[PDB]
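User: Structure with manganese (II) ion, tokens only please.
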Amino acid sequence: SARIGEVKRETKETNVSVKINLDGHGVSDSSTGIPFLDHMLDQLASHGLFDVHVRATGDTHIDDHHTNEDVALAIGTALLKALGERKGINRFGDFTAPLDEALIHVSLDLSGRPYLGYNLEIPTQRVGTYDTQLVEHFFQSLVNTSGMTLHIRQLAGKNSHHIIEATFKAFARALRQATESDPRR
Amino acid sequence: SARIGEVKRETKETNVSVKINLDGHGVSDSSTGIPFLDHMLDQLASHGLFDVHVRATGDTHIDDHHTNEDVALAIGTALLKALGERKGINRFGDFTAPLDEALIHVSLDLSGRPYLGYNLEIPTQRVGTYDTQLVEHFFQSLVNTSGMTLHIRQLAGKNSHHIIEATFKAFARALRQATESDPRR
Amino acid sequence: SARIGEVKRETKETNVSVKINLDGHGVSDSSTGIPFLDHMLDQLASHGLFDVHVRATGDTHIDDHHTNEDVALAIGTALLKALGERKGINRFGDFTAPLDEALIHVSLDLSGRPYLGYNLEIPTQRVGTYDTQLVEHFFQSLVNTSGMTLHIRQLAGKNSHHIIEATFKAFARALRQATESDPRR
Amino acid sequence: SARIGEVKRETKETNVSVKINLDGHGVSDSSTGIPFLDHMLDQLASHGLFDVHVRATGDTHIDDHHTNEDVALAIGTALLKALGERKGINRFGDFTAPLDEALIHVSLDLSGRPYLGYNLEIPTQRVGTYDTQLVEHFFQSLVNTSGMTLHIRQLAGKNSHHIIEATFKAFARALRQATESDPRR
Amino acid sequence: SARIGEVKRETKETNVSVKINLDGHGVSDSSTGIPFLDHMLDQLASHGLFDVHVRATGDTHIDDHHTNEDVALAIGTALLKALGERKGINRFGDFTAPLDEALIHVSLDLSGRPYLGYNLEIPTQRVGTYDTQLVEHFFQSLVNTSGMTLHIRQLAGKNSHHIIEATFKAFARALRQATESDPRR
Amino acid sequence: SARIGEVKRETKETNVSVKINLDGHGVSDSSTGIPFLDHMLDQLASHGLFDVHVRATGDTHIDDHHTNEDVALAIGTALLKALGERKGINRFGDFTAPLDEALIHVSLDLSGRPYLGYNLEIPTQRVGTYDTQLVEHFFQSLVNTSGMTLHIRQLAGKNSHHIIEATFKAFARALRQATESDPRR
Ligand SMILES: [Cl-]
Ligand SMILES: [Cl-]
Ligand SMILES: [Cl-]
Ligand SMILES: [Mn+2]
Ligand SMILES: [Mn+2]
Ligand SMILES: [Mn+2]
Ligand SMILES: [Mn+2]
Ligand SMILES: [Mn+2]
Ligand SMILES: [Mn+2]
Ligand SMILES: [Mn+2]
Ligand SMILES: [Mn+2]
Ligand SMILES: [Mn+2]
Ligand SMILES: [Mn+2]
Ligand SMILES: [Mn+2]
Ligand SMILES: [Mn+2]
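Assistant:
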């Protein structure tokens, strides 16, 4: 029986719907109003083998910040819901992924205690129209509602898109590991 | 009897109308042609319990600068008008507000002598489409027409939107304090 | 009608019961198995005018860590419960308190987003039998379950007991401010 | 047929009995006379899925050193015995585990050649009553009798209990990996 | 049906034949005219569970460079051929292996885009008769024809043979992981 | 008989068609969806006397990265195809071109071994709407599919458009030299 979490959340600023299947096939269905974030959520699905359905609208004329934040918060809650009683899972994930010259290590523990350790140094301010400060905020907000211990470490990288995408690949693979069944539990 | 100041000001560059109620309920009604500034003026209303009505148009195809400046000048004048004879008010305000990792101290004196002390270090050039140099200019122009002594001190912060928004929260709360009745005066 | 939050939480390591009245009279009733923590919780009650009832037992033969953490987590949850819908409160608190040569600034926002900014430099490892690393962990854990934005800044201090106690005084006064009714809301 | 190693060792200073099942269920049964070490050995069992039975007595009135050392030596020998001919196992283990802000990488090879690489910087001298110098000595002594190549690397951390516990989690998971069957061997 | 790639390549300088089975049993059959390289290719087979058959002759009286390069190029092509359509594989590999005091991290992606990140600092010029500059060139040439993203990071090490051998162990294990079936794909 | 290479390549992200005549007249016919890249490809044609026909579409709403990369990859392949057996050509090219204050040296070898040496320091993040990180990626991707040894050295320059355009002029002239007939071969 697949582990599925669903969240709908509305504020004056944003409207967000998330559905995540931890036992998915990598089905990617994300439309946030932030194209670069959509691309990253596609990576989350494809590299994590999650099914990810996201819809968001919001006040992107002000900036992408509120949308990005509210999407992340809802994803964190959806993950928490999907995990249920967390019985029999690996709990810990650890993966280091490259994307060309970029190399990003992610380690996480589905601990119930939120913590983000993050040291990315993204050398440009905009990837497409996406404000690169928002990457940290995405992970911070996700951690806060999921109750995840998450460390993200930049080991190499120069191209901003590579750095951010490698982060999502590594995160997805680490989260896949953590959420999967431990065969001895 | 509520303290209300109104200003209409037209130049070749901009057209601005401001109405501020110092004894308001936080009614936010701001449309400047600069969405991020609108968002900040909403914070001013909600955190200061001012009623803030602003309309502006201007030469935003050149850049947001003239609009931002002329809005600020008019707000400063409206504040001055609303304050009237300044009898029986606290006069001084002092508040430090966070927004997540950002922490901003504002101290002000409704002194009749303009002065801005400002040390924000906003680490990105654009929040949405808003040029972050314009934050200092907003406060400088406001001080100049209001005749306010204003100090803004960045105690912490990394996210530009957080830094700027925390500034407006702290300013609003400090200005609320300064404009309110001193119960012993 | 007084705002009261109650939490009972048991783990393999600890057993904790907390009851907090936000609208209290400073009634202090704290027994955690960690005498220095009891003393600090007494300060929280007396300086914040909270009624604080805490009972904890745990694995203090290993060290005080699990007890300290679980007490803090439960207090954060109790605060959250007590706050209820958070209508009409100040929400923000800001206070700087001395204790002799020590001087500690606390700023907080009852925001729903956990964040701790903390820069205390406590110059000794043990105050009585209390491990001074546990002060940061107390506030971090409290923030995490309460969903509080909390900044703690050491402005001066040399004596470890003074530094820590001044922190609790400042925190208590800032939290009192934040939880109290805003008379214009 | 489960791989079980047993050691009894007596000196003038200490008396130690160890039984370890490499193919266990995480049964934790450790009483060394050093409560913090007991807690760490519980982590070894739970995170490694070893069954760990330890009893020790010794000259803890002098300090915990001889007990800690003799426990570690006996565990290393028990591991060696349990491994038997080492046929068909992964041999290598590599895992990085967090505990909140702490992040510890362990890499090991069941090589038959003892080596410890260790760079932990534990910022306090006592965790509970446990001398934090003894952590290095525990791993060194274990390596020496097991004939293990072991590298322990502190990637992040501030709280001493977190640093040490994360080390044991990472070690346990790496040792589980190394001792498990390689499905292609 | 085992994935086997075969390459024969002749130049004026060298003559090389390679056959690699990705689904092997660790059969090592390598004779390049460079004994140290043979030893490393044996590690590749044994730690990766590849079957590796290599024969090379060349102008080693000039130096080992052309042989080393042409062997590496052919291995990269053989890997590419063996991988075929790359369907259903893990694609990514990440492993850190010790050899006594040496500790080497390898991360790779079978991406189709060649990239080598390499930071080994091998402290001697010759291991046996093998020029230690040739290690980097081996991996660079392999990457270039395989279309692999490869990062090699020296975490510790002093003995040149240990450093280089640990690199091949880590690489072999990471490449095994990447080339193996993903059980959910 | 003119040396013409043609490539059509489609991915989920981009659709690219390239036709290059090494023995051209400088016919420029490039439409990539990235106006600045079009301008640079026009320089390639005019300064190299290549006929360059490029059409690309792609996911430029995410950013220009995938388009830029896929165009470059296809150009590299087209060059490789056009070169055919590479008989009788100069093979090496070396040219240094100014554009006002900018001065860029390009040296290349049509070697069959991909390598990019690149040290441009482009002082602004956007030239028009073009992300200046993409210049390095363009040349890297081109090198990777063409099998070119390419060195790009910034000798002087301040204006980003000048720096990048001078690079394309120098590259075009060096590539013209390398691809032309050696009159003694
Ligand atoms: Cl590392
Ligand atoms: Cl201060
Ligand atoms: Cl030169
Ligand atoms: Mn935010
Ligand atoms: Mn991408
Ligand atoms: Mn101006
Ligand atoms: Mn905002
Ligand atoms: Mn803890
Ligand atoms: Mn005291
Ligand atoms: Mn000793
Ligand atoms: Mn513990
Ligand atoms: Mn060479
Ligand atoms: Mn060897
Ligand atoms: Mn790319
Ligand atoms: Mn031009």
